[PDB]
Structure 1
Amino acid sequence: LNPESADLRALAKHLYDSYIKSFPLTKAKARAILTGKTTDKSPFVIYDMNSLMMGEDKIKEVAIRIFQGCQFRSVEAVQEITEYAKSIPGFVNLDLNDQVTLLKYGVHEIIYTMLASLMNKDGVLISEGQGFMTREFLKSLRKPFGDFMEPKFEFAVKFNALELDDSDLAIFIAVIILSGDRPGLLNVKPIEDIQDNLLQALELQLKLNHPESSQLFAKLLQKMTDLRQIVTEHVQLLQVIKKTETDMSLHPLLQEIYKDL
């Protein structure tokens, strides 16, 4: 109903379109799988060691093998997030060093945001929705691996209570990427100008898509604080594993992201 609000609607639709093309497992598909809907197939459930071995047939010790699988999927997600970032208007026109800095510090916050879409209080979807690993099984793994996912479930349960959908999440993750407060940025003003447009589009999106949810925009921005805490704790646990497991190797792409965080 306004020239400016029409541009914000166009930006919201552009990003939702790019989000669908970049991320193969959407929140809508994940919910259809988690709530037994007829549009998708039921997953094989891994709740103990026997189901894990039968799951490896259907779909290093156990804990390290699961940890390696998570880091493989995180590498895949970095690739998907990088592809999505390039579709955000203005992102590819930024200084190349700043594009790398924004992704270095942004990918982990986005991974945990999108991981919540695959989670409920009972567990997490794996193998592109083919499987489901229980929260209790992950918590039963030998230390320090049994503590890696628990804080992610705590965040996911709170974040999922906002009931965001894919069109909401597309603009939210773009806002996370264009954060002008990352360490080492050379040209902050161009980044903040883009983030302002994205925040304007996110605000209008949440008002139209959730007309009964008061201050959902503020509640969602307050979750960006929960995401930082999760990222910091995750890095601390990786340092513990680095010294305890001299045999374990971390992917080069993930190695560069963690350096000097």
Structure 2
Amino acid sequence: DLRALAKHLYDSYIKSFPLTKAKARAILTGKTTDKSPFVIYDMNSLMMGEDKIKFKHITPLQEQSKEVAIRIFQGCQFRSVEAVQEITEYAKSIPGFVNLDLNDQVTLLKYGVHEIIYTMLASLMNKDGVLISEGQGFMTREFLKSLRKPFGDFMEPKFEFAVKFNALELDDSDLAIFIAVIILSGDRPGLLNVKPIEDIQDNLLQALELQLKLNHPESSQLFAKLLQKMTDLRQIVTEHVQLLQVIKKTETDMSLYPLLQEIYKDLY
């Protein structure tokens, strides 16, 4: 039953991701009872909202560096570590995933997590900025673009993808199946058993197609448009790794968190 699979994935999606697209849209449109997020659009507004950014380390976020760009870098990788953990929890709820070889589960996560991260960033973005710290804050696109090189080049391609991706008007029920399709990619490098992975993605793709026809009966070929976004995410990853390598070659004290180092090591 493809509808039962869709509902199962949505239920797991709700359990794994605290800030859904529905909750993010209510915040971005101001149609919610809670107070507005703190807006970070320049150096002064960052200093006033910096201690509200979730960041648990040896010293506070404001003490990470004298440079604003480096403090943004540190706060963002703290979020990324927790994002990987949320996606891992959701991946384990995909029927058949935990029955795969553990080394293949690792491989699917290693290559899938950042593609999922950039997919779900779009849920937290409008054309002018992105929600941070579980919707508590809002960091503008112009501010992220004003950071010195190469820091100012990181977020802009994610905003560009999000503008086009959000035009598809997917909801959380659509996205739950779509991210499962991405995780169960049989062409990841180093996979040991491709066949059982492709068998799962086949059902996920059928469930996705039925979900889009029911939830978007006016969007003809929405399935075809969405499948083309799966390859866009791989280009974003490729561009992202190159920027991280500029950091590794030209910046000093900067070092990725251990979980992120493990993901990027021997990636492609």
TM-score, normalised relative to structure 1:
0.96
Point out where structure 2 has 5 or more consecutive residues left out of the alignment.
54-65
For residue 124 of structure 2, what is the aligned residue in structure 1? 118
Task: Give the C-alpha shift of residue 40 in structure 1.
Answer: 4.1
> Of Structure 1 and Structure 2, which has the larger fraction of its residues in helix?
1
Task: Give the C-alpha shift of residue 95 in structure 1.
Answer: 0.5
Task: Give the C-alpha shift of residue 58 in structure 1.
Answer: 5.5
- Return 93-102 or 243-252, whichever deviates more: 243-252
Q: Distance in 2 between matches of 1:113 and 1:27?
A: 11
For residue 243 of structure 2, what is the aligned residue in structure 1? 237
Q: Distance in 1 between matches of 2:29 and 2:178?
A: 24
Task: Give the C-alpha shift of residue 259 in structure 1.
Answer: 1.2
Secondary structure of the 1:255 match is: helix
Q: Distance in 1 between matches of 2:156 and 2:51?
A: 27
Deviation sequence 1:55-81 (CA, Å, 0-9, x none): 125664110110111111111010000
Task: Give the C-alpha shift of residue 109 in structure 1.
Answer: 0.3
For residue 79 of structure 1, what is the aligned residue in structure 2? 85
Q: Distance in 1 between matches of 2:193 and 2:213?
A: 31
Point out where structure 1 has 5 or more consecutive residues left out of the alignment.
1-6
TM-score, normalised relative to structure 2:
0.93
Task: Give the C-alpha shift of residue 42 in structure 1.
Answer: 1.4
Secondary structure of the 2:92 match is: helix
Deviation sequence 1:88-121 (CA, Å, 0-9, x none): 0000000111000000000010000001100011
Root mean square deviation of aligned Cα: 1.0
For residue 69 of structure 1, what is the aligned residue in structure 2? 75
Q: Distance in 2 between matches of 1:42 and 1:153?
A: 21
Deviation sequence 1:30-53 (CA, Å, 0-9, x none): 000000103443111111111111
Out of 247, 254, 257, the residue aligned to residue 253 of structure 2 is: 247
Q: Distance in 1 between matches of 2:52 and 2:17?
A: 24
Secondary structure of the 2:206 match is: helix
Task: Give the C-alpha shift of residue 246 in structure 1.
Answer: 2.6
Cα separation, partners in 2 of 1:111 and 1:57, compared to 1, 3 Å = closer
Q: Distance in 2 between matches of 1:39 and 1:191?
A: 43
Task: Give the C-alpha shift of residue 226 in structure 1.
Answer: 1.1
Percentage of identical aligned residues: 100
Task: Give the C-alpha shift of residue 127 in structure 1.
Answer: 1.1
Q: Is the contact between residue 32 and residue 40 of structure 1 (CA under 8 Å) also seen in structure 2?
A: no
